[PDB]
């Protein structure tokens, strides 16, 4: 199938309390596989999925040095940005970075990503062409001119087209079924009387991967969009996800309602009822 790799960095300044805290996490699709935290006792890249553990010491050592350096660079960027925005040197600010590659089934690059937010707002982003930037404001235009002169886009493009594609391919080979084969949800319908006249039907999807899913309730095969309570998809904590959808129905009419589940892991869309 199509796959993606993403790294997410967060740097948060704390003036007066030392250098900014830097955290990175890496994902393949919806699976986190690495982390780094600058405040750890002995900061190093650490495995967060079983299939990455097989990578040799060189891998971990190289990655660890990269994160240490990026933390120092982010510390410089945070100093620069507060200057560009004329902000107090006393306050805490956040710089977030998100980058990676999307590949099709043949493993070729479909789309590259390299973008940044400052205090939760889009700041600068590498365009789809992988060679030009979009800046959100005149501060970000300073960054843009700096990066244009440094040929940063070239460096980004080289990673996104090369190491990003090739390492994602590797992880997919080493993650095998964990990454390549969707895990369908375990589904069931529960029933909870509210009164003599009303009951809740809740449709559950548990233990599915990846996170993308659709749950709908139908009455006589018509979507009950305006009357369905639907929770945001949530992690189970064991790399799988959960979701549910509920509808309140007149007692005695439960038989008219069916729950419909669409997930990549299912052979075909499921129809469930209270039974």
């Amino acid at each position: 199938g199509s796959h993606s790799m993403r790294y997410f960095y967060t740097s948060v300044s704390r003036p007066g309390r030392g250098e900014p805290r830097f955290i990175s996490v890496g994902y393949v699709d919806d699976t986190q596989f690495v982390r780094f935290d600058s405040d750890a006792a002995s900061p190093r890249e650490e495995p967060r999925a079983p299939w990455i553990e097989q990578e040799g010491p060189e891998y971990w050592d190289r990655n660890t040095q990269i994160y240490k350096a990026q933390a120092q660079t982010d510390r410089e960027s945070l100093r620069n940005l507060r200057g560009y925005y004329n902000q107090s040197e006393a306050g805490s600010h956040t710089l977030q970075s998100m980058y990676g590659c999307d590949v099709g089934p043949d493993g070729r690059l479909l789309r590259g990503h390299d973008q940044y937010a400052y205090d939760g707002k889009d700041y600068i982003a590498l365009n789809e062409d992988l060679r030009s930037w979009t800046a959100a404001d005149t501060a970000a235009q300073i960054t843009q001119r700096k990066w244009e002169a440094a040929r940063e886009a070239e460096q980004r493009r080289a990673y996104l087209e090369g190491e990003c594609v090739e390492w994602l391919r590797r992880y997919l080979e080493n993650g095998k079924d964990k990454l390549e084969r969707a895990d369908p949800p375990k589904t069931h319908v529960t029933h909870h009387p509210i009164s003599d006249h009303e009951a809740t039907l809740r449709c559950w999807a548990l233990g599915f991967y990846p996170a993308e899913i659709t749950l709908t309730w139908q009455r006589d095969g018509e979507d009950q969009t305006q009357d369905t309570e639907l929770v945001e998809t949530r992690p189970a904590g064991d790399r799988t996800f959960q979701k549910w959808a509920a509808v309140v129905v007149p007692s005695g009419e439960e038989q008219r309602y069916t729950c419909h589940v669409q997930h990549e892991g299912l052979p075909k869309p499921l129809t469930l009822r209270w039974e």
Binding site: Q70, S77, Y159
Partner: peptide, 9 residues
Amino acid sequence: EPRSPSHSM
């Protein structure tokens, strides 16, 4: 694997 460090902003 992560990308080599960027220039500062």
